[PDB]
Structure formats: structure tokens, C-alpha cells
Design a protein around this motif. Structure first.
Motif, PDB file in Angstrom:
ATOM      1  N   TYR A   4       0.854  -1.215   0.000  1.00 28.69           N
ATOM      2  CA  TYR A   4       0.000   0.000   0.000  1.00 28.69           C
ATOM      3  C   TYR A   4       0.880   1.254   0.000  1.00 28.69           C
ATOM      4  CZ  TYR A   4       0.936  -0.534   4.964  1.00 28.69           C
ATOM      5  OH  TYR A   4       1.585  -0.698   6.145  1.00 28.69           O
ATOM      6  N   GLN A   7      -0.661   4.113  -1.749  1.00 27.91           N
ATOM      7  CA  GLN A   7      -1.779   4.721  -0.986  1.00 27.91           C
ATOM      8  C   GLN A   7      -1.208   5.672   0.057  1.00 27.91           C
ATOM      9  OE1 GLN A   7      -4.316   0.981  -0.287  1.00 27.91           O
ATOM     10  NE2 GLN A   7      -2.993   0.753  -2.085  1.00 27.91           N
ATOM     11  N   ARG A  12      -2.111  12.608   3.845  1.00 34.00           N
ATOM     12  CA  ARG A  12      -3.346  13.328   3.478  1.00 34.00           C
ATOM     13  C   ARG A  12      -4.344  13.196   4.619  1.00 34.00           C
ATOM     14  NH1 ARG A  12      -5.147   9.336  -1.554  1.00 34.00           N
ATOM     15  NH2 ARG A  12      -5.042   7.389  -0.347  1.00 34.00           N
ATOM     16  N   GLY A  14      -6.944  11.696   6.763  1.00 38.07           N
ATOM     17  CA  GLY A  14      -7.277  10.292   7.081  1.00 38.07           C
ATOM     18  C   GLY A  14      -6.549   9.312   6.176  1.00 38.07           C
ATOM     19  N   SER A  15      -5.252   9.552   5.974  1.00 38.89           N
ATOM     20  CA  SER A  15      -4.375   8.692   5.140  1.00 38.89           C
ATOM     21  C   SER A  15      -4.455   7.247   5.639  1.00 38.89           C
ATOM     22  CB  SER A  15      -2.974   9.196   5.139  1.00 38.89           C
ATOM     23  OG  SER A  15      -2.153   8.401   4.306  1.00 38.89           O
ATOM     24  N   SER A  17      -6.700   6.191   7.790  1.00 37.83           N
ATOM     25  CA  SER A  17      -8.131   5.862   7.989  1.00 37.83           C
ATOM     26  C   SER A  17      -8.644   5.128   6.749  1.00 37.83           C
ATOM     27  CB  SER A  17      -8.940   7.100   8.279  1.00 37.83           C
ATOM     28  OG  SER A  17      -9.358   7.735   7.072  1.00 37.83           O
ATOM     29  N   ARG A  18      -8.211   5.542   5.569  1.00 33.03           N
ATOM     30  CA  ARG A  18      -8.678   4.899   4.320  1.00 33.03           C
ATOM     31  C   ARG A  18      -8.141   3.460   4.232  1.00 33.03           C
ATOM     32  NH1 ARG A  18      -8.755  10.203   0.465  1.00 33.03           N
ATOM     33  NH2 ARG A  18      -7.792  11.656   1.952  1.00 33.03           N
ATOM     34  N   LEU A  21     -10.510   0.072   5.305  1.00 31.61           N
ATOM     35  CA  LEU A  21     -11.432  -0.616   4.366  1.00 31.61           C
ATOM     36  C   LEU A  21     -10.693  -1.678   3.549  1.00 31.61           C
ATOM     37  CD1 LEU A  21     -14.055   0.515   5.032  1.00 31.61           C
ATOM     38  CD2 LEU A  21     -12.542   2.496   4.830  1.00 31.61           C
ATOM     39  N   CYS A  22      -9.614  -2.234   4.072  1.00 31.00           N
ATOM     40  CA  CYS A  22      -8.850  -3.311   3.405  1.00 31.00           C
ATOM     41  C   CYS A  22      -9.178  -4.629   4.089  1.00 31.00           C
ATOM     42  CB  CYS A  22      -7.357  -3.034   3.478  1.00 31.00           C
ATOM     43  SG  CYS A  22      -6.848  -1.585   2.511  1.00 31.00           S
TER      44      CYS A  22
ATOM     45  N   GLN E 237      -3.194  -0.763  10.578  1.00 28.47           N
ATOM     46  CA  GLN E 237      -4.635  -0.741  10.958  1.00 28.47           C
ATOM     47  C   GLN E 237      -4.781  -0.677  12.482  1.00 28.47           C
ATOM     48  OE1 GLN E 237      -6.340  -4.052   8.987  1.00 28.47           O
ATOM     49  NE2 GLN E 237      -7.009  -2.817   7.241  1.00 28.47           N
ATOM     50  N   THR E 240      -3.966   2.923  13.565  1.00 31.79           N
ATOM     51  CA  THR E 240      -4.996   3.854  13.074  1.00 31.79           C
ATOM     52  C   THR E 240      -6.232   3.730  13.966  1.00 31.79           C
ATOM     53  OG1 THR E 240      -4.145   3.358  10.896  1.00 31.79           O
ATOM     54  CG2 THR E 240      -6.198   4.700  11.054  1.00 31.79           C
TER      55      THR E 240
END
Ligand SMILES: [Ca+2]
Ligand SMILES: [Ca+2]
Ligand SMILES: [Ca+2]
Ligand SMILES: [Ca+2]
Ligand SMILES: [Ca+2]
Lengths: 376, 376, 376, 376, 376
Positions: A4, A7, A12, A14-15, A17-18, A21-22, E237, E240
Motif C-alpha cells: 500500500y 496509498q 493526506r 485520514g491517510s 483511515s482509508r 477498508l482493506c 490498521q 490507526t
């Protein structure tokens, strides 16, 4: 291996935070079964306490819940987990660093082993193949994915890593130990033969070849060592017991007692122990990262792509020594042939990354005429 | 050495939980005797308090128990243990990294030392034997298992590591120091003799041999240093006192006081101090891991297999230099002789590990026609 | 240096507990004087409070004791000590790793510098002596024990490390800096002279010699650097003040107040503040380990044996280059001359350490006939 | 650089305590101004509260003081400081390790570059001068002290580091980047010229010279990198805000409230918040150590002596290559010419440091006649 | 990359405090959007609670706020963040250390590859260009800024890094993998051709060239590995979720409850939760430093200047091999030609940095006449 990098290139909004969803190689995948078992046990205990206990038995359960909640802090879960996970992560990056890449050796073989005829082709291919065979023998010893691909030396012969003659020679040499070292002795002997036969023009180049091959051998030895000398079972057992005991105590210590009793910490009676669930998430997630990385050559999502590395190494090393031998692009004068200060252009998307050279931290210091004068 | 790499290859449901049913090299083996002593003392104290004290004497014992339980936190057991155990684990992996393997040297000797006749056989075997003898002399100096195998140089001669002539030469050279360094000087002299006698064709190859042998010598020196310069006794004594004082205080501070007195923390009177037992498990288990790894060359279950390493090194090095000298598999064109993109097959059990090449994180970045244009 | 490797070889019952009966290089030796001063001050304060204060003055002292006991936690003693001690231990092992051993160089000199005549003897002895002299010059610069042995260059000449000619040359070259570097320049020049005079047969061997000598020079430079660039005085002062302030606050905050007042934490009035004494033991013991290891070349019990290392290096290097030059044991066929799988015997005390070879973690994986089939 | 190695050689009574009477490079020097500002603000706030507030306004101030004292613990000052200071200390020792010393190169130049005539003198001096010039160019880029000494290349020419011809060549080559790399290209070219002209007798010696010079170049590159790539500003800002916010909150949360109100923590009203002052000392002292070491090439007391290193390197390298070239002490037989076991004497001050050789941990193991017997 | 080395050279009054007025690459830039979202949510919740809830509903909200504030400590935010940030910082400095600099190789090419004619110019330029091309191919694979500059191999040809012939050769060799390795095989082959054609005079110099080129290849491989093997998604994760859950709990647990209820911690009702805002600053700032450094080749302010490095490397390497080939400043006797103790002058601004040489810690030790006497 889940990548990632793209990514997370820029920090950025919520770098990280995104990244929640993995699914592949995620905390949810690692601990959904354990979490479901914990949730089922927690709610079984709650229903038993609320629907299968008399008043005095409920008072006994409440006293036990207060006692357990009070004494939860005795378990040094954070201290044990921190030590263990740091150790596992350090070993994990070392294990990757000891994966053998034939690139240095293959450039040396391509260059030094001379002859565009069939004998030169055969010699260069055989040397690079010995390097690949040594790598694959160690990798199938220490990696479940590579073993499932090549469950026997006959499989290695069918896949083209070993010839039937090499297989017979290995069977003849068979000792009661892992034989991953044999291709290095073969490489040394074949390099000596190539130098004595005039295919290697100088013993200095022979020495360079053997140094690269020996670096690969040391990497393979490190891989063998990490596969053999596991993290001490006692450390693993300590961390496992800490986490399990913590979340078994939680099953009784984190119940919502009767709000009627108005206990000091039990005024509000939710149904979902959200903070207990978050603690489970964090601590069992730490343990699950350790579990996944403890053997980075298994078949987890975040485990190494050993099969891809084997395939790529074979393809690249064969191309480099065979097709690319004394096969160079035409040497012509470059774009900056008579430009003393070449300045490659920028695109519209990169013009903002043009920077003045950093000339050192002292560059902007200001001094007086008398300050800068030498004294006698 | 206990290996469980295969067990922990994949992060599965209770991956580490299934490791709690291991006895060999386990926490239970390390601390069952200490735990039994602690349990006996705890219950002796409980029975004394409950059956050999008057009312006022029981009140005195209860005041002392509250005082001890309150002031237990003064002992910085976690901080001391963390420091000590990290230091021991770091030293332990260094000690393994400094075990000498003759593989690099043995490939170089097999290749460079020429002659399929008796003199060449003898020369190659003697050089590799000097490397093995140096390794074994250091290992019997620093390892109890190797010492119990070879309690004398006469034992080394009877086991074939040393000849009677080598033993006599060692006795003649005897100094009041460990003589593990002697075989390296012998190796250097015999390599010089081999090069002067034409058995080594070039001083560059002689230099390569001496570099590999000197690497082994530096590894042996590191082993000697770790055996000599122990972790400071003061650190060891600090950690020992911390753990012992903590669990001696617990014997009185973790008693179940009379529930009649309804003390602030003593409402529920179990018989088994389960959380005290778990604390003992964790903290004494940390200390026991340190105790086991502090000398990784003893005879613990998780100690190194020095005897196996000695045997394997001897067998492999002799085979490599003697039988495998200029003894190669037939060089024939491989499976991919005219296939520019070799693709070894996958089995049904490994087809899922076929992956597309990772081409770098920037590969999927998307840009416009104007974004990608060079500016003047 | 105190060695207890043999004592801690196996994790046994109270393995570390048996190390608490050690006096030399022990925590008791390190802090008995400090502890006695602390105990005297504590009991002076107790006697002043109990026998030289009126009722109101005793109430004032009790308020101050409660205040001090409450605010003791403000001092971050554990955090400061942890940082400092980790830094000191890391430096300590680096300092040992940079002690120069002439073994690699002495094997190279023994081998490469030719001639069994007086000129060859003299040349080899002089080269190894230059290596020893460089080592001793740095060691007497950085080690108090070596300095007390050799308080002058005239002492070095009387002890045989330097000849009067070398001493005169050093005096002629004298600069206003430590001259420990001079013997390396002498070594390089004498090696060049030996190669030009035919005593070294090849520039490759000359290069090997100079590489080993330069490794020793870099080690000596690291020793000089560690002796010069101390841990920052500010770090040392921070840790010292933290520990001293903590145990000066304890002198008033850990007094046993009048049990009549029945204070929240002061119900039981012992005479010995056992937990305060244990805290002193742990924290001052941590500081004392740092104090002992901060300069590992002093004269502490756990300091390095620099004098022994100097003596041993001189003896071994002279023996290796002079007596062991081209002086090898007779080369005869070994015990396993025609045994392809040599199996050295085991004693009755070591038969249990015979182990089957570890063949890799994937060895016991089981697959079906269809699982192991290659797919097209 | 403040050195106290000699002071801390032995762990004595109050070894670190005697270091609290040091002013140069001390915690008091680092934070007396900050401490005075904090003290002035604290006492201004106390006087405002006690002499410029009505009863209700004093009650409001007391509520705010209790609130601030309660919520001080939210700031993770210790965690932030620990991370930051460990990072700064690691970088600091790396930065020292990357200071280039010409000793290895200067021994190689002294030895290999031949000729006692003017051309040989000139060649050796010019090579070593190129090494010194490269070092000085990087050092004046990254060090404020060296920059203030040599604020221009004309200053370097006046100080003798560069000749006017070298200065003109640098001006001709000028690019928009730091030109500290140029002397390495000059060195490589001049070494090639020396080998082609017969002053270097072998390409192996030329290779040795270029390897040493390239090691120095890599060290210089590391220095450039540390000067360019600062610790991330975000880390620095986080630590700064943590410490400042902690001690700004303390100004109101650590006031002595009216003892009349008899608050839970405010029974005793001192005038000096001694524990707050100690906390300031510890935490701001940690931050001040980080501040001092973040750029170890400034002009702090504990910063590196770059100017001394430049001067010493120039003097030593010139002496080594010019005066010490083929200028050796007379080679005569040493004190132990026919003594197989040389035993240098001890002084009365060092006789106690005579030690028996450590022969390995297994030496004292005792076994029976049957235990030591080999089995078939 | 933001550099502030010059600002932090000396530890001055509020040295780090003056860095809080920096915007570029600052904590404010990293987390103003997240902070604004958090502030908006906090005040929305406050307004809902204070203006859209009945008395009983406000009592429910107050109970929930007390519950959340009590159980906030369950989240191990500090422990998770510490581990993660240490790992990211270690990787970040490794990634910088593996950026390839052509300086060593370019000095070797300038020196060893002979000929001031067009063929020599072309050969040297082509070799250094192969090194630059390999570096740029890896950098555009792993760096978004370099990719946006060179979004295709046609862009590389237009910018002068690759010739059309090299582009055609790459297309012909195309495999389904990153081809950044190809220029190293080209370099090895062209160096072999140069040595066979007499442009390289010795195989030792050829070996030196290939060693430098292979070092660059290993650095490029490390860059590829760091871009491919991301920090495990599970660790990312975990950290975060810890931070997000902590500051989502804070939104309800850190509200100012009605001061009328006079809750134990809620006596004073500010409007701004200043300590919650500081906690957000610290913890989210830690997470933002990790987010920025996790991929140091993105386009953050503190990310590496890869484009500048590419440009500088091209310019410097071309100048070094082409214009600076056998182009040296005139060799003339230096300023200290006959001065045995050169003493470069000091300026008035640097005279205070003149220091006496440190001669070792033992220098000032004092001994008696009898102490210094050798004993028999
Ligand atoms: Ca795995
Ligand atoms: Ca052991
Ligand atoms: Ca000491
Ligand atoms: Ca500084
Ligand atoms: Ca970034």
C-alpha cells in the motif's frame, strides 16, 4: 505480501483511515474467529448471570466480577506483547534481507565468462543455474509455498531447476543433512574448470565470481538458521498465556452488573462492552501481527512471495547470462555530449519539485570583515 | 533447540494457543519447581495465619498483608526484567551468528587446491580439518555439551579431529592460554606451502582462502569473548533480587484476609490466588527465558545443538573437499535452452501462489496529456 | 571481569538465586557505602522526629512526610535510568568489540613473510611487534590499569614493547597529539621494504597484510574516540540528580509516622522501611551498573582485563610469527581417510546430545497425489 | 567536547555525584535562562493570585489550579521525550562515526607511493592534501566552527589547505552544488598518473589506495546527508510543544493554594515548589540534551572539536607521508629474542592486575572415568 | 525535505521553541483538517447535549460522559504509537541510506577508463550513464515525484537518460518484471569490452569498477524491497484504530458537564477542552509523522528530494568522468613544504575553538617513584 506504498505516499486527510477498508491481510481477517468465540462466550456468561442465577448467586457473581475487574491490571500484557512483537518484527526484516538475489552474480557471470559459442552459452547458463538451484533448495526447505510447489527433487527436475544428471549426483552425495550447500561446491569447481579452460581470463575475475556466490551462500545459511532456531518457545508461551488470560478474565470482569446495585463503576448498563472489544482488537491484533510474521515464509497474505521470487530470479538470471552476454546497445554520443551543465526537463506535473541545491547548513552564516580576518 | 516454525507457518485460529501443549523447552519445565516452592510457602503462610494466630495476632497479620499489598508496586520488576531480557536476547542471537560454518571455506578449498592424486587429497583434507579443529577447540572451551563429549585433547585425537602429530605439536607449543588459535596459524602456513608447491595456482586464490579462514577465526574470537565477558553480575543480581523480593512480598500481601472484616479489596475469599499465580507465571517465566538464554551453549532444551553442528560440519567439509573435488554433474543444455521466458509449472497445491510481478508503487499513477508534457 | 558462564550454563532451580552469594563485582560491593550513608541519615531523621520535636512540630513533620510521599512520583527516575543504562551498556559492548587482537594479522605475517634465517625472524618479529606496540600505546592512553603498568615510554622500553631505537624515533617524530598512530605507518613502510626485498613474494599478500593492520588501526581509533567523546555530561548529571533527589525525598517521605494518628498509609509502624531499602537497592544498583560500565577500562571488578590481553597478545603473536613459521605437524591421512560418512564417537556423558539433522520446517508437510501433480 | 572518562574510571562513592560540580557543558548552563523565566512567571502568578484577587476570584483561581493539576497527566511528555532523545543520541554517535580520519589512507600513501626525491615528496603530499581538502570542504559545509574559521575558499587557500591552482580549478569546475566531491576525483586521477609514471609499482596497491580514499568519501557523504536530512520538523515540534505545554500548565497547577481551604493535596503551603522544580530540571534537561546533540557540529561545549580534528589530521597526514616515508627505526633483535614465553614486568601500582588466563567456561567441569569413556 | 540544522546548531534559549513558527512540513500543516473535523464534531455534540436534550436525557448523556472518561485509559494508544513510530523512523533512515550516489564509481571510471580521445570520452560517459539510468529506473518505480517527471521510458529518452538505441534494447529484452536491473548487466558487459579493448589496463581495476557498480545495484535492490514489502497492513490498521477510537471516545468523554451537578471532575466548566486539544495535537501528530515518513518518496514537505538527487547525480557524474578525466591542478609545493608542524591560522570568529590535543584519559594520573617501579 500486501503493498500500500502508493496509498500512503503522501500524508493526506485520514491517510491511514482509508486503510481500514482493506480486507486482504487485515486485522479483521486475522482475528474474526477468535473475536466471535470471545463474543459468544461473553454473551453466554451474561445470559447465564441474568437468567440462571438466584439473588444470592447473582450477588456472588457481582462480587467475582468486581474482584476480576480490580485485579485485571496484574497481567503485564502490554510489556510482554511489546517485547515479543519488537523481536518478531526485527527477525522478519532480517529474514527478508537474507533472501538471495542472483543480480550481482549474474552481471559478473554475463561479463566474465567468455564465448558466444555453444560451450560459453552452456557454461554461463550452468553457473547461474547452480546459483538458482542452491536458492531453491533452501527456499523449499524453509517455505511452505515453495515446498507445496516442489514437494520432491523429482519435481525440481520436472520444473527444470535440476537436470537428471544433477539429481543423480545429489543422490550419490546424499548425507543425513539438508543438501542445499551442494550447488555452491559445484559452482566453485565449475568456475575453477572455466578459468583453467581459458573461459575466465583472470584469477581476479574468478575471485570476484566466488565472492558473489559466497555472499549468496551466507544469505542461504541465515535463512536456514532462522528456520531452525525459532524464537524460544518459552517467550511464545509467555505472550500467548498473557493475552489469553487477560481476555478470559475480561469475560467475567467486563460484564454489565445490575444498575440497581449502583456499583461505583457500573452506573450505566450498555449491552456491548465497546471498550473491552477495542482492547481485544488492539491486544489480539498485536498478537496476530506477531503470529503472522513469526514465520514469514508460510502462506499468509502478508507472507513473502517466495514462488514469485523463484520464478523471477530464474527468468532474469537466464536472460542476463545468455541473451545479454556481449549484447549491448549501440554506443553513441548522448543528449548532453557538449553541455557542461545538463538540465533534464520537468513536466507540468513535476515542475514544483525543481529545488535549489542544499549547499550545507553553514552557507547562510553572516560574518563581519574583522570576524573573517586571520590572526597572527 | 526446539523448532516450531512449521506449526506457526500460517496465522490460524489459536495459532499460539496450540503451542501451550508443548512440554520440552516449555515454561512449565522451566518453572514448576520454583512454582511448587512458592505454592507450598503461600499455603503454609495461609494455614499459619488461619489456625495458629489469636484474634489480635490475626489483626496484626491483616495489617501487615494490607501494608505489603499496598507497597508491592515500589518494586520496578517490569522495568528491570525488560532491560535484562532484551540484553540477553540480543546476546543470544549474536552468539548464534558467531557459530563458524566451514561452507564458504570448503567451496574455496575444493575449487582452488588442485590435484586428484593422494597428495592433493591429503592437502585438501588437512586444510579443512584445521578449520574444523579450530572450531571444535573453541566450542569445547565455551560449550558444556561439547566439553562432555571431548573432555580432553586425547578425546579429540580418539574422535579423529586431531592426529597424534597435531596433538604433540600442540603440547610442544603449549602456552598458559586457550590454544584455539593454533589451527589458524597452521592453516596459513600450509596454504603458503601449497601455493609455493604449485598446488595453489595463484596468490589471488591464496588470498581468498586466507580471507575465509580469517572470517572463521573472528567468529571463534567472538564466541570466546561472549563466554569470557559475561553480562555484568550486578545486572544479573539486580534482576534476580527484583523478582525474588516481588514474589516473597506476594506470599504475605496476596493472602485472602477474613471476609468478615470486609476489607476494601478482600470482599471475596477464594482459596487460589489465581492472578498472583498468573503474575508468577509471567514474571518468573521472563526471568526463566533469560536464565535459559544467558548461556546458549549449556544443555537446556532451547540451547544450541553444538554437537550436531560439529558432526555435520566435519562430514560436509570432508565430503566437499575430497569426493566433490573436480567431480561435477554432466553439463548438458537445460529445459529452457531456447525458451526466452522460462515458466516453471505449478502444482494444484501451489497454483494460488502464482502472482503478477510487483512493478513499483508508482505504476498505477494516472496523469493527463498536459500533465505529462515537458516544459521548456 | 567476573565470569559466571559456567554457573548459568543450564536453567536450574534458583539459577540466578545462587548468584546472590557473590561478593566480587557485586551490587553489595558497588553500593554498601551509599546504602550505609542513606541508612544513617534515615535513622537520624527518625530519631530527630521522635525525640526532638514537640507535638505541633511533630504534626508539621507528619504533614511534610505525607506531602513528600505523595509527590515522590513526580521524579521520572525509571525513565531516566532506563535510557542512560541502555546507552552505557551499548557503548560497553562496542568498547569490548574494538579491543584489537593480533590473531588475523599474525597468521598472515607467519605465512607471507618468508625466510627461516635471522633476517626473516627479525622481520616477522618486528612487524608483529609494531602491531602490539600500536595496541599498547592506545591501551595505555585509555586504560588506567595499563597506564599504571606503563606510566612512561621508558617503561614501555624496559618492558620490551619498544626498543631504544623506536623510542628515539618516536621522540624525533613527537607532535602535540597522541602518537599511537606511528607504529601503523612504521608497519606499512616495513611491509613495503619486505616486498621490495623479496621477503614478501606478491603485492596481493602485501595488500592482505595492510588490510589486517588497517583493521587493527580502525579498532584503536574507535577506542580513542570512546575515551575522548564521553557520554554527554548533561545526561550523566540528569540521571545522577534524579536518583539522588528520589532517595533524599525518601529520607523524609518514607518515615514511619505515629500510628496513633492512624494515617491512611501509616497504620503499621515497622522500624525498617524494607520496601524503601529494596527500591534503593534496585535504583541505586542500576545507577551503579552504569557507573561501573561507563569507563570499562578502569580498575573495577567487572572492568576489562586489559593487562592480561596485552600480555597474551604479545606472547601469542611472537610465538605464531617466530616459532610456528613454516613449522607444521606431519601431514598424514586422517582417521576417516576412506570413510564417506565420518561419525565421531560420543561419551556416556554426551550420548544424549546425539540429534537427527533438522531438514527444514517444510519436511513433514503431507500432500495428496493430486495435490503434488503439476498443472499445464 | 567535555571528557570525564578519567573521573568515572572506577565506580566509587558518589562517582556521578562528584560530576554535579561541573559547569562547562552542564545542565545548569543549558537551562538556567529557561528556569529563571519559569521561576519569574510562577512567582508573578502566585503574587497575582495572593494580592490581586477578591475572595470569589481566588476561589475561581483555586478551582482552575485543581483542574490543571488533575489534568496535567494527559500530556505524554515522558513518551515523546524518550522517543526523540533516543533518536537524537543514535544520530549523534553515527555523526561522530562518520568523521573522516586520514590514518589508513596515509599509511597506504606513505608505503606505496615511492621515491625519496622531490617528485615523490610532492606526489605523496599532494595525495594526502587532496584527502584533507575533501574532508575540510565537507566540514566547513556542515560545521559552524569550521565555517567561521574558513568562511571562503580564499580563506582555505590562505590557510594552506588549497593552492591557488586548485582554487582556480575548482572555480572552473563550479556547478550549482556543493563541490566537496571534487578532491576525490582529483585523487583518483593523480593516483592513476602515479601508477602510469611508475611511482606506484602495482595496480593492486593502486586499488588499495582508491579503496581507502572511497571509504573517506562515503564518510563525507554521510556527514552531508546528516546535515541535509534533519530529524523531521514534526517530531521536533511535537516534543517542544509537549515540554512547553507541560511547564506552562504547571505554572497554574503547581501553585500553593490557601491552606485554610484545606484542599486534599494542599494541606502544606511551602513557598518553593521543589518537586515542580525537580520535574523542570529532569524534563527540560532531557530536552536540552536533545537540543545540544541535534547538531553536534555547532559551538556547544559538548559539540565535536572539528577545528582540532582538521588541524591534527593535516599535521599527522603530512608528517606520515613526507618525513616518515621509508624512515624506520633500526631493526634489531628485541628483548625476548630467545624467550619463548615473554613476561613483561608489572609495577608495584599494577601487580594486582596480573591475572591467570581465562581458559573457557567448561574448564572446571568434573566428570567420572565412565562418563568420559567413548561408546561404540 | 525541510532542513533546520543551522537553526539548531547551538542549544540556545528556546532553541526548539523558535521552531514552532514554521509552517512548511509542520504539525499544523499535517493535522489542521483532522483537528477542524474533531473540533466541529466536539462542539456539535456539546450543542446537542446543551440545547436538544430534556433533563432525563441530559442525565443519561452525563452518565455516558462519565463512563467514557473513566474507560478511556483502556486504549493502549501510547504503546501502539511508540512501536509503530520507531519502526517507521528506522525504515525511513534505511531508505535514505539506500539512495545510490555515483561518486565512488565516478571517481573509479574517471581514473581507470583511459583515453582523452572521442572513444574514451564516449566509453566513460556511457558507463556513468548506465549507472545513472539504473538509479533513475528504480527511482521512477518507487518515487511519485520521479514518476510524475518521467511517466514513460519515452520521457526518459526525451530527458537524455536513455538513448533511442537503449530504449529499443530494453523493449527487446522486456520481461514481465521491473527491468531496473538491465543497466547493471550492460555496465558489466561494457566494462569487460573496455578491458579487452585495452581501455582498462588491468583486471584489478575492472574488479574495482564492478564492485562499486554492484554496491549501487544492492542499494537499488533495497529501495525496491522497501517499496514492495510495506510495513504490515495489520500494524498500520491497529495504530490507526487506536488513535481514531481514542479521539472518538474523547468527543463524548471530554465534554464539560453541567457544573450544577458538581461532578467529581467537572467542577469547572471551560468551553475549550485545552488538554484534550493538546492530547489530540501530541497523539495525532505522532500518527502524522508516521504517515509522512511511511513512504519517504511521496511529495510531502519532509519527503526526500529525489528529483534534485537525480539531476545532481547526472551533472556531477558526467562532469567527473568527461571534463575532469586526467585534468588536474598543477602540482606545486604547498604552504607547509618545509614546516614539520603546520599550523593553519584562526580567524577572530574562531580563535576560541583552538584546543589542546586530548592525549587520553590516563594522561593526568599521578604516581609515586615506588608506584612506578618494575618488580622482579
Ligand atoms: Ca506466516
Ligand atoms: Ca543455557
Ligand atoms: Ca569502570
Ligand atoms: Ca550543537
Ligand atoms: Ca511521504
Amino acid at each position: 505480501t500486501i503493498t500500500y506504498t502508493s496509498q500512503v505516499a503522501n500524508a493526506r486527510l485520514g491517510s491511514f483511515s482509508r486503510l481500514l477498508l482493506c480486507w486482504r491481510g487485515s486485522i479483521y481477517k486475522l482475528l474474526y474467529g477468535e473475536f466471535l468465540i470471545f463474543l459468544l462466550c461473553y454473551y453466554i456468561i451474561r445470559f447465564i448471570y441474568r437468567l440462571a442465577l438466584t439473588e444470592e448467586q447473582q450477588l456472588m457473581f457481582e462480587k467475582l466480577t468486581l474482584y476480576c475487574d480490580s485485579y485485571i491490571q496484574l497481567i503485564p500484557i502490554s510489556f510482554v506483547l511489546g517485547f515479543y512483537v519488537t523481536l518478531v518484527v526485527t527477525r522478519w526484516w532480517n529474514q527478508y534481507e537474507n533472501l538471495p538475489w542472483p543480480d550481482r552474480l549474474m552481471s559478473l557471470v554475463s561479463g566474465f565468462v567468455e564465448g558466444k559459442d555453444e560451450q560459453g552459452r552452456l557454461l554461463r547458463r550452468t553457473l547461474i543455474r547452480y546459483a538458482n538451484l542452491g536458492n531453491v533448495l533452501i527456499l523449499r526447505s524453509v517455505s511452505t509455498a515453495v515446498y507445496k510447489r516442489f514437494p520432491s527433487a523429482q519435481h525440481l527436475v520436472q520444473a527444470g531447476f535440476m537436470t537428471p544428471a544433477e539429481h543423480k549426483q545429489l543422490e550419490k552425495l546424499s548425507l543425513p543433512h539438508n543438501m542445499f550447500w551442494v550447488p555452491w561446491v559445484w559452482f566453485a569447481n565449475l568456475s575453477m574448470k572455466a578459468w583453467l579452460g581459458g573461459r575466465i581470463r583472470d584469477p581476479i575475475l574468478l575471485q570476484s565470481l566466488l565472492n558473489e556466490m559466497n555472499t549468496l551462500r551466507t544469505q542461504c545459511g541465515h535463512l536456514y538458521a532462522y528456520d531452525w532456531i525459532s524464537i524460544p518457545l518459552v517467550y511464545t508461551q509467555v505472550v500467548t498465556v498473557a493475552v489469553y488470560s487477560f481476555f478470559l478474565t475480561c469475560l467475567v470482569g467486563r460484564q454489565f452488573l445490575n444498575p440497581a446495585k449502583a456499583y461505583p463503576g457500573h452506573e450505566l448498563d450498555l449491552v456491548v462492552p465497546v471498550f473491552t472489544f477495542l482492547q481485544f482488537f488492539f491486544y489480539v491484533g498485536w498478537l496476530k501481527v506477531a503470529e503472522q510474521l513469526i514465520n514469514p515464509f508460510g502462506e499468509d497474505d502478508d507472507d513473502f512471495e517466495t514462488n514469485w521470487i523463484v520464478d523471477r530470479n530464474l527468468q532474469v538470471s537466464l536472460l542476463a547470462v545468455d541473451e545479454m552476454h556481449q549484447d549491448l546497445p549501440r554506443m553513441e554520443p548522448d543528449m548532453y555530449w557538449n553541455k557542461p551543465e545538463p538540465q533534464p526537463p520537468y513536466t507540468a506535473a513535476s515542475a514544483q519539485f525543481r529545488r535549489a541545491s542544499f549547499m550545507g547548513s553553514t552557507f547562510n552564516i553572516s560574518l563581519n570583515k574583522e570576524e573573517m580576518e586571520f590572526q597572527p
